[PDB]
Amino acid sequence: AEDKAAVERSKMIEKQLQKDKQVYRRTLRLLLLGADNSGKSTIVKQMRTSGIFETKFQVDKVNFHMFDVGAQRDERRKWIQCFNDVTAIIFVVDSSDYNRLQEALNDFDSIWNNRWLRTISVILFLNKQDLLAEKVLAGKSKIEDYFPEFARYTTPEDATPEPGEDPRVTRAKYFIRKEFVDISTASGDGRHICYPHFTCSVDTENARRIFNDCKDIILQMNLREYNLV
Amino acid sequence: SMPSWQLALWATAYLALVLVAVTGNAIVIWIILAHRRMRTVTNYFIVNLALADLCMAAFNAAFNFVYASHWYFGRAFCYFQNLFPITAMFVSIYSMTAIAADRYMAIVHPFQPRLSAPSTKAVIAGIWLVALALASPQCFYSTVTMDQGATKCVVAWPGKTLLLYHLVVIALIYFLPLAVMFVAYSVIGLTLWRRNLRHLQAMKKFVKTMVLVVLTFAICWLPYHLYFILGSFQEDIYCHKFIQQVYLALFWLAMSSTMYNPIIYCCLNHRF
Amino acid sequence: VQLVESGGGLVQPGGSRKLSCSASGFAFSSFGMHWVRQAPEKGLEWVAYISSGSGTIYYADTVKGRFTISRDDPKNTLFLQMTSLRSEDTAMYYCVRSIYYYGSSPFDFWGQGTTLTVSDIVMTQATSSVPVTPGESVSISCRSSKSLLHSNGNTYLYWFLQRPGQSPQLLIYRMSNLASGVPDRFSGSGSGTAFTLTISRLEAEDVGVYYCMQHLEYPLTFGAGTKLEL
Amino acid sequence: AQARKLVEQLKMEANIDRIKVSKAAADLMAYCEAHAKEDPLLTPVPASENPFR
Amino acid sequence: DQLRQEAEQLKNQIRDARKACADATLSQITNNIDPVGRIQMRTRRTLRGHLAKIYAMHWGTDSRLLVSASQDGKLIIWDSYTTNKVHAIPLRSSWVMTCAYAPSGNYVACGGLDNICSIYNLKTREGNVRVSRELAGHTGYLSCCRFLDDNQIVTSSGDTTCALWDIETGQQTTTFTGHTGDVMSLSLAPDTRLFVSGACDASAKLWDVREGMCRQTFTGHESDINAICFFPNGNAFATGSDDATCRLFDLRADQELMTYSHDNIICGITSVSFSKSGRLLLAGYDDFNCNVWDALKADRAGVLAGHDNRVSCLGVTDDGMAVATGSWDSFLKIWN
Amino acid sequence: HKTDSFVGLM
């Protein structure tokens, strides 16, 4: 078996590796994170012991590979090193349950201050806004029971050009967004940006919101690689 | 020609111009080689612009100042100084428009990748070849002729070739690079404006710095290029004893672009 | 794993004939393919070669310019277009596969063969016929012109066996290494120019014609063949 | 149940036969001293004997 | 209900038994040993071809074939002498953090964030590498399903457990329980009768493969143990942790002998391996460097030169000639 | 050439 015919095999393997580099560099990887009350599986179903679930979807001829993690232990400080060099992290929070909304803040703080996720942007999907409006229009449970600083919060000047709603829906939902951006600024540098959004249960615009936010993360990867910053 | 009291003020320019362009431009190319790697498409056009301006500091600024000041009559040294420093300025311009078209595809179209290390050398060597395709009709017409000077050159005849070749060079090496460097850095600026005290200060230091590198291209190459159709426009005199002072004024201005491209990549590419 | 050869028959000399080899049951595109002819009551002879990816195509000198070997990997077929057939082309043309990596077993599977009847390192076997009763030790020796020990340590020597009415099968591929499906009775040693295939105990399926083949220089020259009769 | 398992495990680890670290370090010295010349990383082989040069 | 403090009473009987045998130190016995010297190693091969982050390598027993895994979803088998690509196996999962080479050479294993250990057949008659088994049943990711005995594998992570699958049947024969945190690294002994195992609860445990019992446990570190490696005689092992220290335990004294640490080093150890003699302790770090430690003097003999990212995998070949280092810069490098 | 000139090349 001549050694020259082994280099022809090794060159034929490298031609398969270089035409798989074209579909690796062109595809965009994402990582879904969130608890069970956050409507994470609904976002997967509205898109078009297994330890990892994968979902492919195209938005205007650009491939997206989501990686919904499951069947793992509670501690995640060891497999989160694997998801360095990902395009974004899609963190979904349930906005309605204010008792479990504080542990969504400590979970988001552990991601944003991670040693291996210092360069990775987060696309927050504040979920079940159809269920947060009913829990402030009915007014039974109210946010300032759990947070002492809601009564000293007022809506800013430019906020939420809604078609029509209550001004307490806007005042509350800008407060839930306010603590999340507060971790995005105080415990982080200008290397990675959080991107807050507001999402319902059945919402056919989540695939467009990911495309517009991932068009922005690639734009700031290019502005630093071309040193135009 | 060249009184020694007036020669020094021109000599302190071209010695300090080459002190910036043989040091500050060569210090780019081993930062990219050794200290950094940057071996994808974003910095293969910068080292080619570094190799173009390192050739024009040594072969078009110090060599063509001796013949500018007016003996070194190499009969084939005029064959070298009629192709290779003229191809070096045609790729110090064609690599500026390759940087400007790679930053267009990185900003306004961030999802189409152009990081192709195979195909980046079909266009690096593709513009070096068109440089020798257009600078050669004066290299094959160099005939050394002198009276008391140091060199010479000559061209054909029916004021037909010297007009139509220099209206093709000014229409493909001045106008066509400027017509794409004005569209590229405008759609870049339209995108960075249509999208707080850290990114607007970044776009002011990026976009408005790169609009002045377009305007320092449009006014430092047009008086140099009009010198070579100056004597074919109703005058027919090159013999006026101020044209020595006109030539060095519109040559140091054109060779200032070999000094700007260091300090642009020393303010953002080397310090940051 | 199967290689069924087609084409063939009677051709008046001066004409042409395309041969075919339909592969089934293995990954055809990762295997190199050879053609080996066998004249009636003679030895084997190497004809053509096409590598995986059709990058390297090597011929023997008696078929060069006249024979053309191709392949079609989506249809898993292998061709041999012969153009002006001489009467030294009356043979049985086998379709042997071969893979080439570190630790591979090339010339491992051969096809049935087609009977076409048209109307360098020299390897010589030390003997031609050894009659031995079942149960004894047999040694089959061969010699080479050039030494088959390359600088990487390998000794490129390939032992075969062709039973009566069958295709050849590989026995020992790099002077010491048994094939897959071959018992430990067959053992091979050598020293660079002298080579020896030893069979410890002999059975009835151990009879046939034993061949040897080098794989240093690419016009692969076989041996004459040593026949064991019982 | 989960505490009777950790107690029964720690009694299995309590009656292990113990050796001194003076006789346990001399059994790491004697292996590294004996196998010293058969280690190409400590003692480098010549360039003829090395399959990378 | 008296078990919570009778357990701490037992854990003081163990520390009194461990301190009764610490009459000396490995630093005291090896004071009159001549040092190894400055070990300059040179990069001999650089194997390129992976598209993404290399997480694991494993040598063959022929000291010539490497296998390597990367996050693109491909295993590449390399020829170390000629820089050739023997095989390219596309995996079903992109996320793989362990790889294996069978000591026969017929099988490679791989596992990752899918909870499956995939055994591949290299000596297939059909010419292509097919998956032989997909060993499922381990809740949580697979960190070091990367050591084959001969045709039974040992697997480690996720459910804080270790397993002893039978590849012919595809089921677990022994489940090793007793770690509190996720189990990061395992090392089989030379006799393939014991294996040591390190987890994120800062403890390393010896297990018996036949009985299924944790016969010893070692609790010396301060953070998660990322790497583990046996001494060549199977009486000692080495652990590298996130606390920038390497520690050398002993199985017959049941304590820690020597700590390999420097005040300059503040980054965790990702990969540890020994030499063929046991004098060198090569350790790969979170920064881009590997260090060569004298295992008898706790001294940095040398330093392996740069990768451009985190050194993730490290293995000294069975002949002791080469040192292979793979990192997150998609490059393997063979040292000497 | 004969009396005066100026050739300053590119």
Numbering used by the authors:
A (entry chain F): 7 to 54, 181 to 361
B (entry chain B): 27 to 96, 99 to 186, 191 to 227, 238 to 314
C (entry chain E): 1 to 119, 137 to 247
D (entry chain G): 9 to 61
E (entry chain C): 10 to 345
F (entry chain D): 20 to 29
Reported in the publication:
The tachykinin peptides substance P (SP), neurokinin A (NKA) and neurokinin B (NKB) share a conserved C-terminal motif (-Phe-X-Gly-Leu-Met-NH2, X-Phe/Val), which is critical for the activation of tachykinin receptors (NK1R, NK2R and NK3R). NKA preferentially activates the neurokinin 2 receptor (NK2R) coupled to Gαq2, while SP and NKB preferentially bind the tachykinin receptors NK1R and NK3R, respectively. Activation of NK2R by NKA is associated with diverse biological responses, such as intestinal motor functions, smooth muscle contraction, inflammation and asthma. Given the important physiological functions of NK2R, it has long been considered an attractive therapeutic target in multiple diseases, ranging from asthma, depression and anxiety disorders, and irritable bowel syndrome (IBS).
The cryo-EM structure of the NKA-bound NK2R–Gq complex was determined at 2.7 Å resolution. The structure shows that NKA interacts with residues in both the transmembrane region and the extracellular loops (ECLs) of NK2R, which is similar to the binding mode of SP-bound NK1R. The conserved C-terminus of NKA inserts into the central cavity of the transmembrane domain (TMD) of NK2R. A polar interaction network between the conserved C-terminal residues of NKA and the residues of TM2/3/7 of NK2R was observed. Moreover, I1143.33 of TM3 can form a hydrophobic interaction with Met10 to further stabilize the C-terminus of NKA. The structure shows that the N-terminus of NKA is mainly stabilized by ECL2 of the receptor. Residue D175 of ECL2 can form a salt bridge with the main-chain carbonyl oxygen of Lys2 of NKA. The amino acid at position 1 of NKA involves the replacement of the proline in SP with histidine, allowing it to interact with T173 on ECL2, which is supported by alanine substitution and Ca2+ mobilization assay. In the structure of NKA-bound NK2R, the extracellular end of TM6 is shifted inward by 4.0 Å compared to its position in the inactive-state NK1R (when measured at G2736.58 of NK2R and P2716.58 of NK1R). The most representative conformational change in the intracellular side is expansion of the intracellular end of TM6 by 10.5 Å relative to the inactive NK1R (when measured at N2386.23 of NK2R and Y2366.23 of NK1R) to accommodate the α5 helix of the G protein.
